Each structure stands twice: as C-alpha cells, then as structure tokens.
Amino acid sequence: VEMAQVDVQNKIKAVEARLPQVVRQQGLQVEASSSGFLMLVGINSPNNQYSEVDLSDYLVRNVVEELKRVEGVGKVQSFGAEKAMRIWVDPNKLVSYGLSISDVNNAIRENNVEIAPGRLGDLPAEKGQLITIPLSAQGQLSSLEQFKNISLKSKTNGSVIKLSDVANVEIGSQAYNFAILENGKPATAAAIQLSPG
Amino acid sequence: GATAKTINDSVVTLIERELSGVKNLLYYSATTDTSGTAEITATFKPGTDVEMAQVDVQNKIKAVEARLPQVVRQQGLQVEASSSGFLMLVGINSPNNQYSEVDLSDYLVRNVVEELKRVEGVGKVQSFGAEKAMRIWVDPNKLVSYGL
Amino acid sequence: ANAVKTAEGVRAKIEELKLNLPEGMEFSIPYDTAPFVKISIEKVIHTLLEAMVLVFIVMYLFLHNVRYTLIPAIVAPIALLGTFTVMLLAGFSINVLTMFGMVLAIGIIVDDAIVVVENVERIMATEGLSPKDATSKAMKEITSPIIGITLVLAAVFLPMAFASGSVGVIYKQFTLTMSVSILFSALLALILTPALCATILKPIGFFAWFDRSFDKVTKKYELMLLKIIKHTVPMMVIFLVITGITFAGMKYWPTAFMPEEDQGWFMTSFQLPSDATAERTRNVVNQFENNLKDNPDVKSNTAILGWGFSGAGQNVAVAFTTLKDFKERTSSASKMTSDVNSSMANSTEGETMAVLPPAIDELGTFSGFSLRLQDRANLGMPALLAAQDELMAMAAKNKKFYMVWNEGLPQGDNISLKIDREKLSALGVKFSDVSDIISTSMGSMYINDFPNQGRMQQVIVQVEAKSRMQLKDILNLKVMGSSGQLVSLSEVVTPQWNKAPQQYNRYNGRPSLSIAGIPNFDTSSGEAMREMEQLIAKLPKGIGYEWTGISLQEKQSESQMAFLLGLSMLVVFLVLAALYESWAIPLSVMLVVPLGIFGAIIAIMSRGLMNDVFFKIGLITIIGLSAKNAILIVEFAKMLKEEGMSLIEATVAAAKLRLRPILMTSLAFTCGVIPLVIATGASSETQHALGTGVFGGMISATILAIFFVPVFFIFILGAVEKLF
Numbered sequence A: 001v002e003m004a005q006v007d008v009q010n011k012i013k014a015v016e017a018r019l020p021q022v023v024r025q026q027g028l029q030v031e032a033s034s035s036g037f038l039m040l041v042g043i044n045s046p047n048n049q050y051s052e053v054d055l056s057d058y059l060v061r062n063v064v065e066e067l068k069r070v071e072g073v074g075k076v077q078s079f080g081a082e083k084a085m086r087i088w089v090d091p092n093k094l095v096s097y098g099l100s101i102s103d104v105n106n107a108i109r110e111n112n113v114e115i116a117p118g119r120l121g122d123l124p125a126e127k128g129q130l131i132t133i134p135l136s137a138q139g140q141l142s143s144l145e146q147f148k149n150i151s152l153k154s155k156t157n158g159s160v161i162k163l164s165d166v167a168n169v170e171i172g173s174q175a176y177n178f179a180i181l182e183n184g185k186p187a188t189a190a191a192i193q194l195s196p197g
Numbered sequence B: 001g002a003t004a005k006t007i008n009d010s011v012v013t014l015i016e017r018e019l020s021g022v023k024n025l026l027y028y029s030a031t032t033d034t035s036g037t038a039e040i041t042a043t044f045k046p047g048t049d050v051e052m053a054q055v056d057v058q059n060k061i062k063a064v065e066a067r068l069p070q071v072v073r074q075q076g077l078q079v080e081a082s083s084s085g086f087l088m089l090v091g092i093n094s095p096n097n098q099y100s101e102v103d104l105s106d107y108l109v110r111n112v113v114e115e116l117k118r119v120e121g122v123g124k125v126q127s128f129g130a131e132k133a134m135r136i137w138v139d140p141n142k143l144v145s146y147g148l
Numbered sequence C: 001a002n003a004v005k006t007a008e009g010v011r012a013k014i015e016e017l018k019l020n021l022p023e024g025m026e027f028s029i030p031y032d033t034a035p036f037v038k039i040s041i042e043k044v045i046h047t048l049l050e051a052m053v054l055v056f057i058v059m060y061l062f063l064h065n066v067r068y069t070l071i072p073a074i075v076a077p078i079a080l081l082g083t084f085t086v087m088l089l090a091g092f093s094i095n096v097l098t099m100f101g102m103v104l105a106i107g108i109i110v111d112d113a114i115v116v117v118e119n120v121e122r123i124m125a126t127e128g129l130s131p132k133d134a135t136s137k138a139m140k141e142i143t144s145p146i147i148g149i150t151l152v153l154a155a156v157f158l159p160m161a162f163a164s165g166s167v168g169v170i171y172k173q174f175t176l177t178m179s180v181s182i183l184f185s186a187l188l189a190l191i192l193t194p195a196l197c198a199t200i201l202k203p204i205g206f207f208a209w210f211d212r213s214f215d216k217v218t219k220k221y222e223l224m225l226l227k228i229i230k231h232t233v234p235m236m237v238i239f240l241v242i243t244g245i246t247f248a249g250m251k252y253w254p255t256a257f258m259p260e261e262d263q264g265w266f267m268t269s270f271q272l273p274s275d276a277t278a279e280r281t282r283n284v285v286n287q288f289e290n291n292l293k294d295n296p297d298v299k300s301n302t303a304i305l306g307w308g309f310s311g312a313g314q315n316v317a318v319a320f321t322t323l324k325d326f327k328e329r330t331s332s333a334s335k336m337t338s339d340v341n342s343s344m345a346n347s348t349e350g351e352t353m354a355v356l357p358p359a360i361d362e363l364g365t366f367s368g369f370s371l372r373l374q375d376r377a378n379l380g381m382p383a384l385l386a387a388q389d390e391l392m393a394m395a396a397k398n399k400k401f402y403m404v405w406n407e408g409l410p411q412g413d414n415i416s417l418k419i420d421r422e423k424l425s426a427l428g429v430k431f432s433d434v435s436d437i438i439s440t441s442m443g444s445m446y447i448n449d450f451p452n453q454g455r456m457q458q459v460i461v462q463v464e465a466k467s468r469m470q471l472k473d474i475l476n477l478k479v480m481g482s483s484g485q486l487v488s489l490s491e492v493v494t495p496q497w498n499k500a501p502q503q504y505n506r507y508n509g510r511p512s513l514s515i516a517g518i519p520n521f522d523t524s525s526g527e528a529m530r531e532m533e534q535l536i537a538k539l540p541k542g543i544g545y546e547w548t549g550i551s552l553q554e555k556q557s558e559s560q561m562a563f564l565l566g567l568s569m570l571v572v573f574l575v576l577a578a579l580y581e582s583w584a585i586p587l588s589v590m591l592v593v594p595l596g597i598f599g600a601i602i603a604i605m606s607r608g609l610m611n612d613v614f615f616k617i618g619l620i621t622i623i624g625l626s627a628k629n630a631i632l633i634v635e636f637a638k639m640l641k642e643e644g645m646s647l648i649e650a651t652v653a654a655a656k657l658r659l660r661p662i663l664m665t666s667l668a669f670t671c672g673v674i675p676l677v678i679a680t681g682a683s684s685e686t687q688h689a690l691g692t693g694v695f696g697g698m699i700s701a702t703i704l705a706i707f708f709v710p711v712f713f714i715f716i717l718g719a720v721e722k723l724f
C-alpha cells in the first residue's frame, strides 16, 4: 500500500499546476484504505448546551490524542466540523454604503495579517554590540470582537464604518454539508483503527 | 516569519499528531528555535528498514500539507535519513592571510562542497561558510526623506 | 555507508582538488574518526594472534610433541575460515564484536581435537597400540561426549540472538561467530583429526618432570576425591551457600551497558546567555583555545561558532579537540575533559561542557545519561522550567553525579509591540503600511539572482546595521498619515518586555526538556539512573520522565537478563536430557552454573568492573564451558555404571581418567583470554570487560567442578535410587 500511495502522489504532483486555484488551495487528500476498524467513540449533549462544532472541538483538543497514546491504538479518524470564523454579509447593507464583497475581503486580508518578527543585534552587527534581543509584533485577529471592529471606508460619503454594520460575524463550521445526530441530538464521533499486529 | 511558539503551535504539533502511528516506532521528538526552522526526529526499532520508514513517514505527513501554513507548503517539508555525527571535517585556511574568511568560504562552496558531496557513501555535506552575494544596506532614515 | 571507504574516497578527492588550489590556500583535515576503526581492528587481530600462540603453547606444554600439538591446532584456522564464509553468506561484516567472538572461541574450537589427541596418546602409551588402532579405539570411546559438548555449546548461545533492541544486535555477532565456529570445529575434529592421528603420528628434561608431577597430582587428586566423597551433605550445604552468595552478588552489584573508551578526541559545548552576541561567545572560545594551547597532548583544535548539537544561534558554540597518538600522549581524554571543565568553570560568563564521545556512534552525541522531563498534565511551560530548576538544584548537591546540566537554549527576554489600531484609524494611518515597515525593518529579503563570474548569486536587501541595533531605531520608523505629516511608530506602538523560552522541545508529543548528566567515578550508569529516578519522584505532580538514547537501551538490556539466562539453562538441560536419556544426569550437570558464576562475579568485583553486556556474554560462555567440564566426567561415570561398576567406584574412575582432558581444555581457554585480561593501550577497557569475567568463571569452574560434579552425580543418583 505504501508503494502505491507514494507512486500515486508522485504522479498527481505532475498535474497539480493545471488544477483550479481553489482546488490547489484546499489541497488534494491522498489516503490508503484501511480495514483495521475497532470501535467508535462519540460525545453527545443531552441538554443541547453544546453544538456539533463544540463537541468536535473538544474531542480533537482533549480526547483524540489521549486515545491515540493507548497501547494498540493506531489511527483515529474524527468525523465532524472544524471551527471557523464565519462572516455573513447582507447585500442590502453593503449597497447602502456602496460597498461590495471584494471590499470586505480586502479589508479582512489587510487588517488580519502576520508581521515578521526579527532580532535586534542580528549579524552582521555594529562593533561593540553587546545585547541581542528578539522582537515580535502581532497583527492577526484572534477574537470575535476584533473581527467585528474591523474598519471599512464608505465610498458614498467617505465615513468610517465597521464590519459588524454590514455583516454578522460568528464562530461556525468550515463546512455545513454533514450533520451527526445521536438519538436526535447533536453529536460527534471518531473511529479507532486497530494497529497492525 | 514566526516566533518559536507560533511554529510549535502551527507546524511541529500538527505534524507530530500524524507521525504518531508509524510502524516500528520507538519514539518521536521535535525541536524549534528562533532561527525559523523546526526539526522532528522519529526513531524506529533496531533492525528496521530505513527506506520503508522514509516512505511511510512521507505518506503519513502528506495528509496534513493542506493545513500547513502557506510559506512552509511552498518551501516544502523535507524528509531525510538521519546521521547523528560527523564523519570528518574538511577545512581550508590561508597561512599568510592572503584570502579572508569570506573568500575561503566562497571557494569552499563553489569548488569543494559539490565535489565532496558526489563521493560515494557521502550522505550530507554541511558547509559552515557562505557564498558571496550582492548586499544592499538601506538606511531607513534616508529613503523616508525621499518618500520611498 | 562504510565509514572507512567513504573517508578514503573523501581523502582521495581532496588530493585531486589540491592541484587546482590558488596559492595561499591550504586544505586540512583537523577532525577524522575513520582511522581509529582500523586501529581497533588491527588491535583485535593482534589479540587473536596472541591468543592462538598462547593456546598452542599450553597444548605443547601437555602433549610434549610438536606433531601432537599441531594436530589440534590446525582445526582453528579452518573453523575460522568456515565462519568467515558463513558470515559472508548471512550478511555479517568484520567488526570488533565478531573478531572478539573469534578470540573467545579460539580456546573452545580446540577442545574436541584436544580430547581426541589426548585419548589417542593415552591409549598408545598405556596399551602399546599402533596409531591407527589407538585412533580407532579412542574415537569409539569419545564419539558421544564430543557431540554432546558441541550441541550444548552451540545451543547455549542461540537464545541471546533473539533479544530485542541494540543489545540483541550485540549478542547476535557473538552468537553467530561462536556457534558456527564451534560447529565447524566439531566437524573437523570428527573428520580430519582421526585421519591425521592415524597417518602423521609416529609409533611411540622438563617433559619428564612434568609427567612425573602430573602422575603425582593425579594420585593426590584420587586420594582427595576418595576422602571427599565420604562427606556429601556438608558439601551440598557449602554448594547452597555458594549459590546464595552468587545470587546476592549478581543482584546487588552495580550494572552498566558498555565500558567507556578513549577514541583520541573529545567535544566541547559553549552555551551563553540569551542576550549574548557572537563576540561574547568568541571571547570564551578564545579563552578555551588559549587554555588548551601549549598542551603537548593536543594535535588540532577546531571551533564552530554559531552552531550546536542542541540548537543553533549567536550564543552557542561547539569545538572538537583531537589528542595525539596514544604512545605520544601522557594523559587520558577523561582527565583532559575534567581539567577543561575545571578551568572553564571559574572564569567564564557561560556554561562550558567538555565531554567524551558516545559509546555508540549514532546512539547520542555524548557519553552519559540523557533524560526527557515531560509535562504530562498540561501544567505549562513555566511550571516545567521551575521543575527543571528544582531538579538541577537537587542534582547539584548529590554525590551520585559528577555534573548534570541542560542541553538546550536558555530562556530569554522578548519584546512585543502592541499596535493601537484605534490611534492608527484616528490619525489616518493604514495598518498594512505599519505591518510592512515593521516586517522589513530588520530582516533580509532575497530578491533576484545576478551573474558573478559565471555563477548565479543572490541579491539580498537589508537594513543597515546601525539602524537595527536598538529598539529606538525601530521606534524611529515613520509612516505617512492622511493629513500628511509623518508619524513615528513610538506614537502608535507600545513595547512590552517578557521572559519566555527561546526553544520549544517535545518528546512523544508532549512538552519536554532535555537533560544530560555524567555519573561520578565509583558510580555506575545504573546507579545514576536509579538515583535520578528517585530525585524525579520528588517533583511536583503532573511531571513525568523518559529515558532516551543509551539509557533506554541499557534499561532494556537489564530487563531481559533473567529470562535469557533461564531459557539458556533450560535449553542446555533439555539437550542433555535428550542426549543421555535421563532426567537426573542433566540435573547433576546443571549444578555447575553457580560454580562458575561464583568466580566470574568475584573477578569483576576484585577488578572493580560493572555488570555489562560483555559480562553477560561471558556468563553464557561460562555456562557452556562448565556444562562441558561436568559432561566430560559424568558421561564416562554413567557408562562405567552400566558396565557394572558401583556408583562411587565408577565416578572416581571417570574423574581420574578424565582429569587430564578437562585441565587441558580449561587451561587452553584460560590462557586464550589472558591477552584480553591484561590488554593495554587503546580499546583496553572493552577487552578487560570481555575477558575478566570469563577468566574468573573458567578458573572457578575448573577448580571447583573436579571435586563437586562427582559429588553432585553421586548424591543425585543415590536420591533417585532411594525415592524410586
């Protein structure tokens, strides 16, 4: 299986360029079919206090690796939705201010950015330099309020408006295609594959 | 473009999650410093085929290339066989200071390193010198005056 | 890849590249480890030759004739050649372990031929028979014992080749190189030796004295044995006492993995504070070079500034120090490292560690114990570092360790600039501009390539050094506002100073810290590991530990000793039961293992040597050899018993007749290992470890067995007769 998978990946690498840009950005996932299924581990919320995304987040953060380090446990496949920062834009509010989707995307790409850290005193250094110290800056946004406070410029009047005004920002799922129900309530699951031998 | 903490939380842990689970693995470890590079090492049981181990590792690490940061993705994740120590050190020096360290380091890189690396049985040649380059030292206070 | 051949190719290539070298440039090879391999190989070959010569001399001292001595001696080179063929077929390579196995087997592989020739000579002398009739009678008498001894000594080494880990690989070399050689020696003894005895043996001072003295000693041995057989229960009690002492010594004696060897070079690591610069590290490296200057025992010193084996940066350095030849040297590498550490400790602003090369090439980069302290309860990095500091505090006050330190970059200062986005919006500044001016302020940007003298070379744009040395220069950077005036970063960014780690390490997917330590002299690796475990047990909850590198292999080797010994003993017992069709005859032969382990442990205690893998291999060899010395008497005693003689009479006659072969065989093996015992020079530690235990065990088995195995036989057979 390993020698088939490596050959397949090497042959796929040839046409990676001609593929559509979004497919490249998402990435092509290559795997080998496994038959060592052992069991399923799931978490459910009887009181609906949590959603599927929250349960999946808890499972991946605090459960999957715990099960992985148990003797005889090999691969763990978590089924669910990964959390993401979802912005839902109202076209009427956007046109009210003479703004478009591209403007919102540009604002997000601008305000949320990574700043390259550096070192003061790095080589080549001025003679007599004694102290060398790292220096870093934070440009990324890590909170809902920060994303909601992003500033856009209205073309109609030139006033400064907030992203929350033209859109609703929340924490949701990267994809909403699938849902998992445990006895009619939100749930998440992970399949444990037995290690060979 | 990241600190040690960011690389640890973005690259090392994400990859090491999938590394756990290869065949005939004794243990795995990871190290990250402020040099912008991260090194993970997987140790396999004695009497194990290294060639099979490399392909297994490559298969298990290509399933996370998508989630890996863009810069690492374009630069690539490099898999290699491990050699702990140095077989030997080959040096060049100027008895009469005719050539400076930069010149010696340029000659070593551009005439010696590649020749040595092609000797049968040589796995890796690590040159502790740098090739010559065109350096542009920009004064921050000057270009701002001209608005650049 | 082969180290020796790769080094030869590198040295050849350098030779061709010398001609096209601009004047004023000279090549050098300050650090090279390949030669030591060939030096060790040639040393082990010399040891093998010395063992062969000593064994030949011992055989001559007994046989008194050159032809008689040659007849057995010829079997060893042929057996070794067959073993070489088997190694080539099986994929094994010539190395120190296989050659040491050959050296150990050189005494064994002559035992069968010695037994054949001794019986032939005895028959010719006593019965006045021709060489061909004497050979026929001798072989008819001794065919079975040779096969039994060969099978036992081949089977005894088999189990240790099935062990796991590196210790299994080590045992595999000895198992093959001993079992195959022993089988080939037995085949030669059964095939060629009778023909030579029948063909090249002619009919029949110091030698006369030796003969008369040996007859006198044989008479004294017979009388002493006759006296001894009367007292059996006391001699069972004494044997139980000896077994108890052997068990106590085996359990309560320090254990190790592999002796530390002098390879003619040591390593030095300089770790300086996080805020240190290249000049500061260069200063301490210059002090180290000056201190090592003028020392006659140093050939060449090379220092790599800015790189390390546990992290790279501006505050790290590594140096390789090569010592002169062993004959020209006057101080051991360990003393050199100790002096270097003592000198560097007093006057330096950082930590300098001088260490010796590891026991195995790729199993670590230093000799000592390596630990991984892990945060297993999500305690946090600062908690892990506090636990590290407390562990270092406990370890620095203990007499069980010499020096324990951390192999990683120190924790250090970090500056973080918090950007006031509200102020940026109010002033009209655009965030991306700030982001760009900060990112490129003190970083090197690779742009394009340009042709320099026929090679593409990089164009790198960076800010001048004078403007990236202090935080003020970065805070002086200005950006354009909406109103038009330039606003400096200091107005819009606030600096914050914090203490955070500069290196992040993980072991088995958990936050981890690497620790190294050197056990103090008079303390073994196992003792140091146990004490370190006890100290770690006192750390706060949520902190765990792991043993990595040499430590894990040593633990695994120590774990498997008892099972291997028991399985080997059971295999020998089963083989003996199969051969002699009894459950009591093997029982008597199985009681000599304590007699040899008593004496092996005694020798290692007297010489102050630890229980290591080579000691275990010697123990297995002594099990085999003691089983041989018991069999040599027990087989003939039993056979005489079926002929019609009584138990005591048959046993006494068998011991009297088989004294000479046993003494010859045992002395041949014992003298075959003296070169290892008294080895001096390079690699002498490994030879001593491999030889002292076997020397002591063989002596104890030879001296004690001749008086104990007859009593074991009589006691066990009498008990069997009484009960059933």
Ligand SMILES: CC[n+]1c(-c2ccccc2)c2cc(N)ccc2c2ccc(N)cc21
Residues within 6 Å of the ligand: A079, A080, A178, A179, A180
């Ligand atoms: C990711 C979709 N997907 C697949 C799947 C669909 C197509 C291709 C490969 C797997 C799946 C396949 C099998 N056998 C069993 C369970 C699931 C599953 C379960 C839950 C979920 N939320 C998505 C799930």
